[PDB]
Amino acid sequence: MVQQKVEVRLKTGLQARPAALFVQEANRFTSDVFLEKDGKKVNAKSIMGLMSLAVSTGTEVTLIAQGEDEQEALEKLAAYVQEEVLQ
Amino acid sequence: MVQQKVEVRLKTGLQARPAALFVQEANRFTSDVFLEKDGKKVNAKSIMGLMSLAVSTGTEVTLIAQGEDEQEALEKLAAYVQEEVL
């Protein structure tokens, strides 16, 4: 057996469970909702879309909502992404 | 429309493609391979296992290889994980 400590330089993104829950919450709104970082935009109502964005825990991203319930969508989703929960 | 910058506090891990390619590379060897962080060890020839480790780009993890070709497996996978070109 041999071991070595290495630095992960491969791309990371949201894990499956957190992404699935994000989508469940985002689907409650009629607004289009996107997550954006470095000019790349993904659909927040898509599990595979959310997991395609390169992000690390602690990274800053832009949450965008457009539609009739955009304020409510932004409030609920910003809380979710930041591990907060408003209720 | 409205927007707001937020900090991602949700858990992250290797993306699907890099995880799948790591396994393709590991499949080249007969050795069993594992990745370990913070007491959590996963089978590195399992894509789901690989992706279940909480990691961020830049994080340090321990790569473990055991088998007949363990030394060569370790070298080649260490280079892959660190994105080093030969």
Side-chain angles (χ1 to χ4, degrees):
Chain A
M1 183 263 287
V2 287
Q3 332 190 311
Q4 185 181 347
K5 204 163 178 61
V6 295
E7 184 184 326
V8 175
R9 291 200 178 112
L10 302 173
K11 293 179 186 187
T12 53
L14 295 174
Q15 289 203 2
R17 181 181 169 280
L21 294 179
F22 194 142
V23 168
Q24 288 179 207
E25 295 199 17
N27 281 142
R28 296 184 183 113
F29 306 100
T30 67
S31 287
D32 279 345
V33 180
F34 298 97
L35 218 51
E36 173 172 31
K37 187 182 177 56
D38 300 333
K40 302 296 196 28
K41 195 164 74 173
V42 303
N43 185 351
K45 293 180 178 174
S46 168
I47 297 178
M48 296 195 80
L50 278 173
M51 293 183 65
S52 72
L53 192 66
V55 301
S56 295
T57 300
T59 295
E60 295 289 311
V61 298
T62 301
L63 224 200
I64 300 165
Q66 180 179 40
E68 69 190 14
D69 53 13
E70 65 190 21
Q71 287 293 353
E72 303 97 285
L74 194 68
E75 289 155 2
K76 259 64 171 59
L77 299 176
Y80 176 74
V81 177
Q82 297 180 305
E83 288 265 283
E84 303 171 325
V85 55
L86 78 120
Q87 56 181 201
Chain B
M1 98 178 215
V2 292
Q3 66 175 55
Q4 183 180 333
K5 289 196 183 65
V6 295
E7 184 185 334
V8 178
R9 292 194 178 116
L10 302 173
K11 279 187 180 179
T12 56
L14 294 172
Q15 282 190 359
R17 188 59 172 172
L21 293 179
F22 179 104
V23 175
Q24 280 181 195
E25 203 81 79
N27 280 166
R28 278 214 268 131
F29 310 101
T30 64
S31 287
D32 279 338
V33 181
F34 307 89
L35 269 196
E36 174 164 4
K37 221 230 185 312
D38 299 330
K40 175 71 181 305
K41 187 169 74 175
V42 303
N43 170 7
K45 282 191 173 180
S46 167
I47 296 169
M48 283 216 270
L50 226 34
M51 289 189 71
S52 81
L53 206 62
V55 304
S56 291
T57 300
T59 297
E60 291 279 323
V61 296
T62 297
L63 176 63
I64 304 165
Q66 48 203 51
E68 188 168 354
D69 53 10
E70 67 185 37
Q71 184 62 43
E72 80 167 318
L74 185 81
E75 294 176 11
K76 212 78 39 132
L77 299 169
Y80 173 80
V81 172
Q82 304 187 114
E83 289 195 345
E84 293 177 338
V85 181
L86 245 292

